[PDB]
Every structure is written in structure tokens, then in C-alpha cells.
């Protein structure tokens, strides 16, 4: 008879809300059974009672480590259903802040993974960079993480004067912080002993289990939605896709570090190529008019009133829109019945399938190995439970 | 376009093999990590001396709500209920009637700050800059009830913070 253990929810490596029922023989893990729903808040049903604008902030709170990326996925779905196009400067701002968001997420993932493993120091070094990044969020929107900045039609406000220079100043120094983190972890023999050949997954199994993102690219699969199915202006920036060879924790960590470096590259290109112009679509039946126009012209006041009370009607139809979020493929299946409120909104989170693969990935490992594999899957339960 | 992260090979000459053996027996990379932590030890820390020092914030920062006035002292709010309609959390409750002088004014304006998500949609929707999210963020309480703001509380907040609120609006309104 195996011993049965509750790993979480009140556990340091369980991320607060995950209860993992583990069957063990000694410390060998005979079976993993994740129990979730401890953070199920009924987001998908709540959205059915909101307008599209009212539903937008719910996406900030799904993957609360990558807010603007969720906003962008939802905005792209709604813009596809509306048959409208965001203005170019809005698309460049979207890509820039998406890469800043990827930096935030990869910092959180790598440092918390290292903290589970036992290396506590890099968390403190990198969370000051996260703090500086938070200021960029707050300066653009007034909120440190739940910005609600990216909306269908573009962005809510234009960048304040002086933001680009400060982003450039941060970006010209972040590479040295990456170098220090890699000096602490990459060649360390304890870190390699804790990560090499742990949670090895084959390419075929990764595809069949619904994996996406690094969980694919660590196993050698050459796939990135920004390259294969680009959105906004991602087909105008140069970057490389890091590819692993072993499908284990160490290769996935290396991939995430290199993705941070490539995000720095993309951010540099975005900073140098930002064009002038308007920042939301020039269509007042979708995007609200400027406040000066609202207080001067009758049509602007009417459209402000209607967009903020009823909201825009979306033509009937259904779309599955996916992006390369920092944690993998993040998707929305959005069904519009023609009214101003969405009929159905199914949210596809990469962590759902990734955590469903945890029992397969943990076969033949110990307790500490399972801690490492949980860290390597990059799970946030806001998106898992929704 | 892609790159490999873990596809390198070690040279098998006696120099490289002996260097690897010396690293194995004398723990050179562990000493490198120790040197990195020692270097960080002599750097100046990033800690600020709160509450004597504060974190930087933008004029766009969303804080505690307030209800504003015209320079004559008249309330800006005219009970259009656009903030109530747009509020994603249904945190706003408004009741209105004609005033004694016939003006369109609220009799009830409640914000449940434990329902509020501080998104700032109410202040975007307001046509007369009546409801705002101010700069204050230090308003923790000892009871739940104190966070259910009525109209008197919000008017007091506006009267108390208007000097800062007006300056922040003057700084940001050309972007809105």
C-alpha cells in the first residue's frame, strides 16, 4: 500500500491553490492526481453578463503574471469578430508591452522555479527589475499589473512623453541581470543535477497531450505562433526561437533564458520603429471619441453615451483566436449572438493541458523531482481554473 | 529562424580534459557563484525607507475614489448613471431626484470598495469629470463596513484631495 499525501494547497511549492494528491512509495512518486478548482471563480459564466468592454478586465486576472498578453488575445478575438483593424501605432505599442510582459513572466517563472529548487537569491535580484517594469505599466495605465490597457480597437491611451527613453534605459541594462542569473544557475553542478533529465517528454507525447510553447520547444519541436501565425506587427521584428534537445527541465530553463534575451532584442526594435499617429481605431461606433470631442460635438456625445451604457454590437459568429503568450498558446473561443454581450467565451489556457500532463511527466521520479517539474511547467492557476 | 541552446560538444584534448578535472576536483564554478554573491554584498541596496520614502507614481495612478465640484462649490455629478452602467463589478448604486431648486442631482451615490476592481472605467465614462480615482492608496480599515462608501464619504474625499486631483487631471487630460 502506497502512502497518500496532500501536497498543497497550503504549501510553498503548491502555488497557493493546488492540492495534489500524491501516492508515494517512500519518496518515489507512484501517482500524481492534481485537484484544481480551488481558484475556480466562474469567469466564463460571469462574462456572459458583461459587455465586451466590461468583460475585458476579467482577462487581466486569468494569467496574472502576463496581463497585457491576455488583453491582447481577447482584443484580437473581438477585433476579428468586429471586422475592424487597430491603428499601426497601437499595434507597435501592443507588441512592445507584450514583450515587456514576457520579460516579467519569464523572470517570475525562472526565479520561482529556482526558489522551489532551493536557490533563493536570484528571486530578489530579478524582482527589482519586475518592479521597474511595473512602473512602466503604471505610467502607461495607472495600474501596476491589471492595466486593462489593451482594448479591442487599439489601446486606451497614448504613451506619456518620456516613457520610451526610460524603457530604453531599462532595456540597455537588463542583459547584465540575465548574465548574473546565468552565472548563478546555468553552469552550477547542483542546479544541473536538479534539472538535467528530469521530466523528459517526447515530441510526439507533447503534441498529443496538448502542450504548447516551451513545453514543445524544449523537446525539439520548431514551433512558435509569433513566427508561424503572426499577429499585430510581429512579422516586422527579427528574433530567434530557442530550441531544446533533451525535453527536460534544464533545456526548458535554458530556452526561457534565451527567450528573455530575444525579447530584449524585439523590444529594441520596437523602440526604434515606433511610428506616429492615433492609438485607437478611428471609428466611434467601436472606440470611444476623445473627451474634448465628446464635450463639443453631438455625435461624439451620443456615441460616448451608447458605448459606455450599451456597448458596441458585435456581428454574430464564432472565432478561435490564439496567441503565443509567455506560458504557451493562449486562446479564446468567442461566440457572439449579435448583441452587445458575448454569448459564450471559452478560455484556453496552456497550463491546463500542461498540468494534465504532470502525472505522465513525473513517472519514475521523486518528491523533489516533482517539485522541479511543477516549476518547469510554469503553471498559474488563475488561468487553469478561470 | 531558430537557435539551439544545448547542442555543443567538449574538446577532448588533454588540456580541456585536465581543466574539466580541475573544475571537478576544485569546484571552480561554485567559487564563481560565491564571488557573484560577494559582489552583490558590497552593492548599495535598493530598499527605500518607507514610510519616510515612497514609491514613484504617475498622474494616471488609480487610487481611492472621490466626487468633485465646480469652482463655485456646485457638485459636478448630474446623476446620468453612466458610471453605474459601465461598472464591471456593479459596485456603484445611484438614486436621484430633482433637487429643491430643480437641479438633476443624486440622493444616493454608493461605491462598494470591496466590490470595486479599481479599473477606472467610471472616470472614463463620466462626462463631467465628477467621479475620479484619486492618488490616495493608504486607506486600510479595521472593519468591513468602513469600506462601503456613501455619497458623504466620497464628497469628503473630493474636498480633502481636490488640490492634488486637479493637478493630476491638468497633467493628464491632454491624453484623454
Amino acid at each position: 500500500s502506497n502512502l497518500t499525501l496532500n501536497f498543497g494547497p497550503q504549501h510553498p511549492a503548491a502555488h497557493g491553490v493546488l492540492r495534489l494528491v500524491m501516492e508515494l512509495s517512500g519518496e518515489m512518486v507512484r501517482k500524481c492526481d492534481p485537484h484544481i478548482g480551488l481558484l475556480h471563480r466562474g469567469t466564463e459564466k460571469l462574462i456572459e453578463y458583461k459587455t465586451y468592454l466590461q468583460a475585458l478586465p476579467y482577462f487581466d486576472r486569468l494569467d496574472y503574471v502576463s496581463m497585457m498578453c491576455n488583453e491582447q488575445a481577447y482584443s484580437l478575438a473581438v477585433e476579428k469578430l468586429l471586422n475592424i483593424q487597430p491603428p499601426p501605432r497601437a499595434q507597435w505599442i501592443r507588441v512592445l508591452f507584450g514583450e515587456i510582459t514576457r520579460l516579467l513572466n519569464h523572470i517570475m517563472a525562472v526565479t520561482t522555479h529556482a526558489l522551489d529548487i532551493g536557490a533563493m537569491t536570484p528571486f530578489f535580484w530579478m524582482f527589482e527589475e519586475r518592479e521597474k517594469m511595473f512602473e512602466f505599466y503604471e505610467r502607461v495605465s495607472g495600474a501596476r499589473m491589471h492595466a486593462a490597457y489593451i482594448r479591442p480597437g487599439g489601446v486606451h491611451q497614448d504613451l506619456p512623453l518620456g516613457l520610451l527613453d526610460d524603457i530604453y534605459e531599462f532595456s540597455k541594462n537588463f542583459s547584465f541581470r540575465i548574465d548574473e542569473l546565468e552565472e548563478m544557475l546555468t553552469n552550477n553542478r547542483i542546479w544541473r543535477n536538479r534539472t538535467v533529465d528530469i521530466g523528459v517528454v517526447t515530441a510526439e507525447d507533447a503534441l498529443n497531450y496538448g502542450f504548447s510553447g516551451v513545453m514543445l520547444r524544449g523537446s525539439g519541436i520548431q514551433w512558435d505562433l509569433r513566427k508561424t501565425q503572426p499577429y499585430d506587427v510581429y512579422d516586422q521584428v527579427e528574433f530567434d526561437v530557442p530550441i531544446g534537445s533533451r525535453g527536460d527541465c534544464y533545456d526548458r530553463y535554458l530556452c526561457r533564458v534565451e527567450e528573455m534575451r530575444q525579447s530584449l532584442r524585439i523590444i529594441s526594435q520596437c523602440l526604434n520603429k515606433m511610428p506616429p499617429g492615433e492609438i485607437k481605431v478611428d471609428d466611434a461606433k467601436v472606440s470611444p471619441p476623445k473627451r474634448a470631442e465628446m464635450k463639443t460635438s453631438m455625435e461624439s456625445l451620443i456615441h460616448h453615451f451608447k458605448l459606455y451604457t450599451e456597448g458596441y454590437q458585435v456581428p454574430p459568429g464564432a472565432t478561435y483566436t490564439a496567441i503565443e503568450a509567455p506560458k504557451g498558446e493562449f486562446g479564446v473561443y468567442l461566440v457572439s449572438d449579435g448583441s452587445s454581450r458575448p454569448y459564450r467565451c471559452k478560455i484556453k489556457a496552456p497550463g491546463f493541458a500542461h498540468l494534465a500532463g504532470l502525472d505522465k511527466m513525473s513517472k519514475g521520479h521523486m518528491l523533489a523531482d516533482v517539485v522541479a517539474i511543477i516549476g518547469t511547467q510554469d503553471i498559474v492557476f488563475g488561468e487553469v481554473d478561470r | 529562424t531558430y537557435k539551439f541552446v544545448n547542442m555543443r560538444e567538449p574538446s577532448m584534448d588533454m588540456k580541456s580534459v585536465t581543466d574539466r578535472a580541475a573544475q571537478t576536483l576544485l569546484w571552480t564554478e561554485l567559487v564563481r557563484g560565491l564571488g557573484m554573491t560577494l559582489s552583490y554584498l558590497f552593492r548599495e541596496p535598493a530598499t527605500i525607507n518607507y514610510p519616510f520614502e515612497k514609491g514613484p507614481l504617475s498622474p494616471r495612478f488609480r487610487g481611492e475614489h472621490a466626487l468633485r465640484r465646480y469652482p463655485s462649490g456646485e457638485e459636478r455629478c448630474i446623476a446620468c448613471k453612466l458610471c453605474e452602467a459601465v461598472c464591471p463589478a456593479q459596485a456603484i448604486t445611484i438614486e436621484a431626484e430633482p433637487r429643491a431648486d430643480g437641479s438633476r442631482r443624486t440622493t444616493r451615490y454608493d461605491i462598494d470598495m470591496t466590490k470595486c476592481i479599481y479599473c477606472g472605467f467610471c472616470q472614463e465614462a463620466c462626462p463631467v469629470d465628477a467621479i475620479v480615482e484619486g492618488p490616495n492608496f493608504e486607506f486600510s480599515t479595521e472593519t468591513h463596513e468602513e469600506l462601503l462608501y456613501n455619497k458623504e464619504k466620497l464628497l469628503n474625499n473630493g474636498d480633502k484631495w481636490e488640490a492634488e486631483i486637479a493637478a493630476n487631471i491638468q497633467a493628464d487630460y491632454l491624453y484623454r
Binding site: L164, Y168, R261, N272, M274 | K15
Partner: peptide, 29 residues
């Protein structure tokens, strides 16, 4: 009647930004 004023990159673009790995050898034989 002033010119359009927006947050934009300085003429000639921003200075080059480093991203590649930098782990010096830094050791004896």
C-alpha cells in the same frame, strides 16, 4: 497651432542594446 507632439524615438534612433550571453572564461589552467 503648434506642431504635433508625441512620445517618439530620437532622430537617428536609440543607442544599441546588448542581449547576448556574456560569461567570461576568467580562470587559470
Amino acid at each position: 497651432a503648434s506642431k504635433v507632439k508625441q512620445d517618439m524615438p530620437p532622430p537617428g534612433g536609440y543607442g544599441p542594446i546588448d542581449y547576448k550571453r556574456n560569461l567570461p572564461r576568467r580562470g587559470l589552467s
